[PDB]
Design an enzyme around this catalytic site. Structure first.
Site, PDB file in Angstrom:
ATOM      1  N   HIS A  41     -44.107 -35.033 -19.640  1.00 29.74           N
ATOM      2  CA  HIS A  41     -43.383 -36.088 -20.361  1.00 29.74           C
ATOM      3  C   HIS A  41     -41.925 -36.210 -19.959  1.00 29.74           C
ATOM      4  O   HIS A  41     -41.262 -37.111 -20.463  1.00 29.74           O
ATOM      5  CB  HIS A  41     -43.542 -36.034 -21.859  1.00 29.74           C
ATOM      6  CG  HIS A  41     -42.822 -34.922 -22.509  1.00 29.74           C
ATOM      7  ND1 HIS A  41     -43.504 -33.810 -22.944  1.00 29.74           N
ATOM      8  CD2 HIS A  41     -41.521 -34.813 -22.862  1.00 29.74           C
ATOM      9  CE1 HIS A  41     -42.612 -33.062 -23.560  1.00 29.74           C
ATOM     10  NE2 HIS A  41     -41.392 -33.599 -23.497  1.00 29.74           N
ATOM     11  N   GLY A 143     -34.788 -30.933 -26.152  1.00 33.12           N
ATOM     12  CA  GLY A 143     -34.272 -30.352 -24.920  1.00 33.12           C
ATOM     13  C   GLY A 143     -34.918 -29.016 -24.579  1.00 33.12           C
ATOM     14  O   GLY A 143     -34.876 -28.587 -23.422  1.00 33.12           O
ATOM     15  N   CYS A 145     -38.044 -28.472 -24.390  1.00 29.37           N
ATOM     16  CA  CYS A 145     -39.269 -28.734 -23.625  1.00 29.37           C
ATOM     17  C   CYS A 145     -39.256 -28.028 -22.289  1.00 29.37           C
ATOM     18  O   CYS A 145     -38.226 -28.007 -21.618  1.00 29.37           O
ATOM     19  CB  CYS A 145     -39.475 -30.232 -23.443  1.00 29.37           C
ATOM     20  SG  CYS A 145     -39.757 -31.111 -24.985  1.00 29.37           S
TER      21      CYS A 145
HETATM   22  C1  LIG Z   1     -37.501 -32.966 -31.063  1.00 30.57           C
HETATM   23  C2  LIG Z   1     -38.090 -31.654 -30.615  1.00 30.57           C
HETATM   24  C3  LIG Z   1     -37.863 -30.496 -31.341  1.00 30.57           C
HETATM   25  C4  LIG Z   1     -38.431 -29.315 -30.925  1.00 30.57           C
HETATM   26  N1  LIG Z   1     -39.206 -29.212 -29.837  1.00 30.57           N
HETATM   27  C5  LIG Z   1     -39.443 -30.305 -29.103  1.00 30.57           C
HETATM   28  C6  LIG Z   1     -40.317 -30.127 -27.899  1.00 30.57           C
HETATM   29  C7  LIG Z   1     -38.893 -31.549 -29.472  1.00 30.57           C
HETATM   30  N2  LIG Z   1     -39.169 -32.723 -28.705  1.00 30.57           N
HETATM   31  C8  LIG Z   1     -40.320 -33.430 -28.800  1.00 30.57           C
HETATM   32  O1  LIG Z   1     -41.257 -33.109 -29.528  1.00 30.57           O
HETATM   33  C9  LIG Z   1     -40.377 -34.665 -27.921  1.00 30.57           C
HETATM   34  C10 LIG Z   1     -41.794 -35.160 -27.742  1.00 30.57           C
HETATM   35  C11 LIG Z   1     -42.297 -36.183 -28.533  1.00 30.57           C
HETATM   36  C12 LIG Z   1     -43.634 -36.541 -28.467  1.00 30.57           C
HETATM   37  C13 LIG Z   1     -44.491 -35.884 -27.597  1.00 30.57           C
HETATM   38  C14 LIG Z   1     -43.975 -34.899 -26.781  1.00 30.57           C
HETATM   39 CL1  LIG Z   1     -45.011 -34.137 -25.604  1.00 30.57          CL
HETATM   40  C15 LIG Z   1     -42.646 -34.527 -26.841  1.00 30.57           C
END
Ligand SMILES: Cc1ccnc(C)c1NC(=O)Cc1cccc(Cl)c1
Ligand SMILES: Cc1ccnc(C)c1NC(=O)Cc1cccc(Cl)c1
Lengths: 304, 304
Positions: A41, A143, A145
């Site tokens: 992504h 971030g 990710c």
């Molecule tokens: C905001 C946040 C907080 C903590 N960890 C993470 C990884 C995030 N970010 C997300 O989830 C962004 C996202 C949205 C939809 C699908 C996917 Cl694969 C990724």
């Protein structure tokens, strides 16, 4: 003496972290040999995330669109491919800090250390368990990710997790290093059900053995139980059913303490039915399930 | 989202760990520049530890008696000196992996990460607080001596602790990197009183703010209190008295959440007087005091 939620030393993994940018999205990548692994992504914009067609989005990208930076030096991307939910960016330079490593798909109930990163830089390390429902209760912000989970056996790092997403419930979802999600999750901005979670029974028993080894013994009682009777209690309290395979893995701790596994099950049964009565075990006021029997033996014997 | 007892990435410290042997005793040393630091009791035999005369024991030792090994390579010792409870072994080679570093003496209530080591090899990393009584509740076995505690600010490692001893009560005692013990402890095999410990009030409040930021809000109430009234409750429950300096350090979290510090004190007052009623906060069934206000802001903002 003492018992802590200990993580593996993160040094071997820190040397693999890189920043990957595509368009306007920046996340973490894992540089092993001449390949950088990251969540697919990275190729999405916020608008794409509602229902992305990753195949179509990736076709609009070329090797030069993936900016990979290891600390301060830029890596040259000579190939790109999508494998499940991960992108593999072939680079012209093998990471000189690549440790001996393996890619493993862990089982639910197993533990691992997470090296949380932002912009390719490590911020912290913590130990956690993959829940029976395939989520992890991590500490991740936007971030994070591409941050990875791993175990280490002497000089070999077994990478087991790559962080992808935070569910609307605040719990975390990710993949193995082949990009296959743990659980039913999809890399899409949609509400997604995580199944009913349960407490990892064998880990709670392992932690009760760690408590006995370290002097906390108040919960030991004059009772015993059977696997059948214990499992009736486990079902009532949303605990995983205990099997003979679980009993067998607890054998070393049973032998070290002289407390038969079914006798420890009877202590756990009484703790489930009566609570802790305002007391603590290893500094916790609840039953801890993030230590496997292997973790307890490792910590209690000082394996480096 | 999520809140974990996160440790600093240990990589910069792993590159400094060495094994030091003197006679028949082996422990861990810290190799920074051309000096190896280790607990002075490496020069003792088990019989010496009852009441050692370190000056006399060290006089019987020469540079060639200290065997220092960094992984597989042997270091050449060209000088030795005792500073308080640490030995400083000058070596002919500067550690190529020496990070930017400082030696700091931390205050009680502050936190740090520990890299537990055995035979100069890192086994795990965990986060802990220096108790108000100057002990640490670590996880250390025989051979862990010389393992160090540290904090990291971008590229600078501030070493604050070196592990020396386990008290008969199972809690841990050690020194700053100048060899000065934290607390009243002496490096001797004798029963030693650790003072009355208290709960680190400002850290519990910081952790309640982390709970609010992460969605756990059930404990917020319609009440407020004063520093005086709160401190009457703090004294009754063996909590450290809250000062305006503590309130001032909580300002960023108060501003981020919109909950005035004295309003959070009233929530803490009600939790102390009524308990948690079988509920949890950030996955804990007790009031957590191992996160400083700085740790909460760092974890909640993703500082790398
Ligand atoms: C905001 C946040 C907080 C903590 N960890 C993470 C990884 C995030 N970010 C997300 O989830 C962004 C996202 C949205 C939809 C699908 C996917 Cl694969 C990724
Ligand atoms: C056995 C053990 C367990 C955990 N940590 C440690 C550090 C140990 N070892 C000791 O305490 C040995 C020792 C005895 C008396 C004084 C001193 Cl300075 C050192």
């Amino acid at each position: 003496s003492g018992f802590r939620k200990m993580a593996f030393p993160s040094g071997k993994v820190e040397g693999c972290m890189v920043q990957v940018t595509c368009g306007t999205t920046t996340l973490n990548g894992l540089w092993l040999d001449d390949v950088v692994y990251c969540p697919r992504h990275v190729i999405c914009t916020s608008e794409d995330m509602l229902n992305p067609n990753y195949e179509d989005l990736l076709i609009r990208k070329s090797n030069h669109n993936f900016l990979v930076q290891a600390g301060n030096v830029q890596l040259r991307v000579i190939g790109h491919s999508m494998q499940n939910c991960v992108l593999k960016l072939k680079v012209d330079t093998a990471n000189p800090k690549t440790p001996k490593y393996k890619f493993v798909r862990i089982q639910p109930g197993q533990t691992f250390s997470v090296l949380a990163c932002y912009n390719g830089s490590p911020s912290g390390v913590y130990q956690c368990a993959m829940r029976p429902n395939f989520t992890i209760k991590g500490s991740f912000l936007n971030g994070s990710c591409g941050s990875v989970g791993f175990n280490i056996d002497y000089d070999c790092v077994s990478f087991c997790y790559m962080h992808h997403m935070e569910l609307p419930t605040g719990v975390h979802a990710g993949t193995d290093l082949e990009g296959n999600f743990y659980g039913p999750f999809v890399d899409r901005q949609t509400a997604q059900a995580a199944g009913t979670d349960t407490t990892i029974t064998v880990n709670v028993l392992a932690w009760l053995y760690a408590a006995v080894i370290n002097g906390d013994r108040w919960f030991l009682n004059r009772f015993t139980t059977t696997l059948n009777d214990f499992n009736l209690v486990a079902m009532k309290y949303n605990y995983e059913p205990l099997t003979q395979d679980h009993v067998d893995i607890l054998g070393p701790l049973s032998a070290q303490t002289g407390i038969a596994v079914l006798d420890m099950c009877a202590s756990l049964k009484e703790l489930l039915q009566n609570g802790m009565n305002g007391r603590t075990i290893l500094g916790s006021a609840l039953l801890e399930d993030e230590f496997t029997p292997f973790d307890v033996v490792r910590q209690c014997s000082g394996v480096t």
